[PDB]
Amino acid sequence: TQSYTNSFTRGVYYPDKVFRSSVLHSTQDLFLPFFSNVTWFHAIHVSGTNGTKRFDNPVLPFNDGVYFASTEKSNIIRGWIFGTTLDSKTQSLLIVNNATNVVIKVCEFQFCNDPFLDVYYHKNNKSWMESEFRVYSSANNCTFEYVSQPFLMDLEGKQGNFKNLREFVFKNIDGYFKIYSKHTPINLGRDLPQGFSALEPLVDLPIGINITRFQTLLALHRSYLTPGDSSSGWTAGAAAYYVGYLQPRTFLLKYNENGTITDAVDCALDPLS
Amino acid sequence: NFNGLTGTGVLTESNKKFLPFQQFGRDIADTTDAVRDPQTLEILDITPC
Amino acid sequence: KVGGNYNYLYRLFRKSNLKPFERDISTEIYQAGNKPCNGVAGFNCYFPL
Ligand SMILES: *[C@@H]1O[C@H](CO)[C@@H](O)[C@H](O)[C@H]1NC(C)=O
Ligand SMILES: *[C@@H]1O[C@H](CO)[C@@H](O)[C@H](O)[C@H]1NC(C)=O
Ligand SMILES: *[C@@H]1O[C@H](CO)[C@@H](O)[C@H](O)[C@H]1NC(C)=O
Ligand SMILES: *[C@@H]1O[C@H](CO)[C@@H](O)[C@H](O)[C@H]1NC(C)=O
Ligand SMILES: *[C@@H]1O[C@H](CO)[C@@H](O)[C@H](O)[C@H]1NC(C)=O
Ligand SMILES: *[C@@H]1O[C@H](CO)[C@@H](O)[C@H](O)[C@H]1NC(C)=O
């Protein structure tokens, strides 16, 4: 279960921490190229009576930072795990987002078997979900605990047709792990809206390890509204779980009179650009 | 002398909408024009003599 | 010490140069020959530390 789509003008953030207004700034950094293609991975739960395997948590290359977008009203997505081997021989991050906290632990966790999963996995009759996640086993030699405020909140969705698109970008430069984020309340029917909404800086950490793989700690205990298909290659579907890769591009940003970013032009897409 | 960045000029109350992660303000030619007070969360505008 | 100090270790063999401010603490036998370095120790298989 995987498809493709087009990311029109999404994935732009503030390069630095200096206020600017009514001016055009030319910058060069790791950005998401305009009109690039982004994959769709869908988490499908099949035959809740039975226990059919899902394979809903693929491992992705993480080549020079990644862009992430999710459109879910619930808190089904909970954290992302990074690392080069995800074994006991190497050190792996454990960014985990529970109800009101974020625990970041860089360590050499022995194993990450799987999230807890009920055999029925049915949420049409039951709704409560209490303390049913435990992924690791041991932690021998490590530091850098960062218990802090939750990164992603939950905006209220009312009257239907109102969902919040959550966008994140993670990068690693000279042993520093940078995370930017933005939660756009307005997407409506369009799967990936076309427009501009800059990402504000969120967190910078001194991790200092190599990262060549990552995946998600998706709580596969239950999941609704997850249609399935056998499509592959250049096809279409529905996933509500996006991902894309950054490249070292040069952009030209236009700053509004109020200090916000209104428009941007890529300097490597077309001859006219 | 705001947090180690010296200068010279008159300071006035400013009406620029900063952001929580933004402290300094610049312009063309890359010179400081607006500063955020360290002790109190206030925005000041610098004008030369 | 007069007898000798052995509590200080340093790595000599590894696949590639490490990026700035990055630390490697893995203790695995380096593949320094055509022989598959699956064993604990042997010729063409060096302890990096
Ligand atoms: C990228 O995605 C598009 C669909 O939007 C597809 O046609 C193309 O083959 C993909 N790969 C590229 C452009 O390398
Ligand atoms: C989230 O985790 C933190 C630390 O692990 C804990 O203190 C907090 O109580 C947790 N949240 C809830 C709602 O239990
Ligand atoms: C943790 O430290 C001990 C003692 O220094 C060492 O024996 C052990 O191998 C270390 N853990 C890992 C995963 O290397
Ligand atoms: C800047 O903010 C003011 C304050 O409400 C608003 O009236 C004005 O429309 C904003 N400017 C732009 C270009 O949106
Ligand atoms: C000390 O610094 C804090 C920073 O926010 C400020 O709120 C407070 O008023 C300062 N105290 C005095 C006595 O100036
Ligand atoms: C570990 O970090 C080094 C530092 O340059 C990098 O070359 C390597 O690709 C990373 N991953 C592995 C598996 O060695």
Side-chain angles (χ1 to χ4, degrees), chain A residues 1-120 122-162 164-221 223-273, chain B, chain C:
Chain A
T1 310
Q2 190 184 324
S3 78
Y4 292 142
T5 192
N6 189 44
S7 57
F8 304 86
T9 56
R10 312 215 70 88
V12 59
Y13 49 85
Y14 291 83
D16 51 356
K17 314 222 181 313
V18 162
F19 176 82
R20 286 143 185 148
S21 66
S22 71
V23 74
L24 319 181
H25 196 64
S26 192
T27 190
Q28 182 264 289
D29 204 8
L30 299 173
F31 288 95
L32 192 84
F34 279 166
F35 299 96
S36 179
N37 59 31
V38 298
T39 62
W40 284 7
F41 293 100
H42 203 177
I44 43 168
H45 163 54
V46 182
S47 191
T49 303
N50 303 345
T52 312
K53 327 161 191 178
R54 302 181 192 180
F55 288 147
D56 294 346
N57 282 47
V59 194
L60 285 86
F62 195 99
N63 44 0
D64 283 29
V66 295
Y67 165 79
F68 200 107
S70 66
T71 312
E72 290 158 9
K73 308 200 305 182
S74 189
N75 42 37
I76 299 304
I77 301 299
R78 280 152 160 230
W80 314 269
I81 177 168
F82 305 84
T84 176
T85 303
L86 278 79
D87 265 8
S88 47
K89 308 155 281 292
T90 55
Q91 294 195 334
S92 303
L93 266 71
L94 199 59
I95 306 169
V96 168
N97 303 66
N98 73 340
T100 44
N101 267 283
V102 171
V103 58
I104 303 169
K105 290 171 65 68
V106 65
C107 203
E108 67 278 20
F109 301 67
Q110 198 184 1
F111 295 115
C112 314
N113 63 7
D114 53 346
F116 284 73
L117 190 142
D118 267 334
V119 56
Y120 59 97
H122 201 54
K123 64 186 288 185
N124 259 322
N125 211 5
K126 307 302 274 185
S127 63
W128 284 273
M129 281 275 198
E130 59 279 42
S131 303
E132 289 174 351
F133 191 75
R134 187 68 173 82
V135 65
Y136 61 96
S137 75
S138 179
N140 300 316
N141 317 329
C142 53
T143 51
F144 199 77
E145 305 277 325
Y146 189 89
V147 165
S148 293
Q149 203 76 253
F151 284 174
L152 71 166
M153 284 73 74
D154 196 89
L155 303 173
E156 160 70 26
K158 35 187 170 51
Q159 313 299 130
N161 70 87
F162 194 63
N164 47 351
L165 166 66
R166 294 181 184 271
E167 321 197 59
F168 293 84
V169 64
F170 320 109
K171 44 197 293 189
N172 186 326
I173 313 178
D174 62 281
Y176 292 166
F177 198 95
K178 292 154 282 293
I179 298 175
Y180 313 79
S181 66
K182 171 88 184 323
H183 305 265
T184 305
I186 296 170
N187 48 60
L188 272 70
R190 181 73 270 172
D191 52 357
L192 189 61
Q194 40 195 20
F196 293 98
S197 181
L199 305 176
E200 293 83 3
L202 173 44
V203 168
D204 188 356
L205 302 175
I207 301 299
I209 63 170
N210 53 4
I211 304 193
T212 58
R213 271 165 73 181
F214 77 97
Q215 66 151 332
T216 305
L217 296 102
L218 181 43
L220 277 172
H221 210 77
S223 59
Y224 201 60
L225 281 158
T226 179
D229 62 357
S230 46
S231 291
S232 277
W234 308 283
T235 43
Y241 173 86
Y242 296 167
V243 65
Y245 306 117
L246 312 170
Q247 281 140 35
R249 298 291 210 83
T250 291
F251 276 36
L252 183 81
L253 300 162
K254 159 185 201 154
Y255 287 90
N256 220 347
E257 57 181 0
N258 289 16
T260 59
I261 295 188
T262 303
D263 278 329
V265 55
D266 197 348
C267 308
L269 187 64
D270 290 349
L272 188 40
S273 286
Chain B
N1 191 1
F2 284 97
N3 295 357
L5 306 102
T6 46
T8 292
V10 302
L11 303 150
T12 314
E13 295 216 73
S14 54
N15 44 5
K16 293 172 182 173
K17 297 307 158 222
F18 264 49
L19 276 194
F21 71 101
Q22 271 165 0
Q23 174 161 24
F24 284 109
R26 279 206 200 137
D27 68 329
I28 297 89
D30 288 334
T31 189
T32 317
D33 178 44
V35 183
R36 151 171 293 185
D37 198 296
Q39 293 218 340
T40 183
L41 269 299
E42 209 187 86
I43 321 291
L44 307 164
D45 203 58
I46 302 168
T47 293
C49 317
Chain C
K1 292 194 284 284
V2 55
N5 215 330
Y6 300 87
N7 266 18
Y8 294 109
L9 277 296
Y10 70 103
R11 176 184 322 270
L12 192 41
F13 306 97
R14 91 180 312 269
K15 296 295 289 183
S16 298
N17 299 57
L18 61 83
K19 273 206 291 317
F21 285 153
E22 307 209 325
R23 173 209 293 103
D24 211 25
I25 57 154
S26 176
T27 60
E28 56 92 20
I29 312 300
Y30 181 56
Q31 179 71 86
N34 303 322
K35 174 202 291 179
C37 282
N38 293 345
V40 194
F43 189 44
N44 312 328
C45 299
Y46 301 153
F47 194 21
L49 264 73

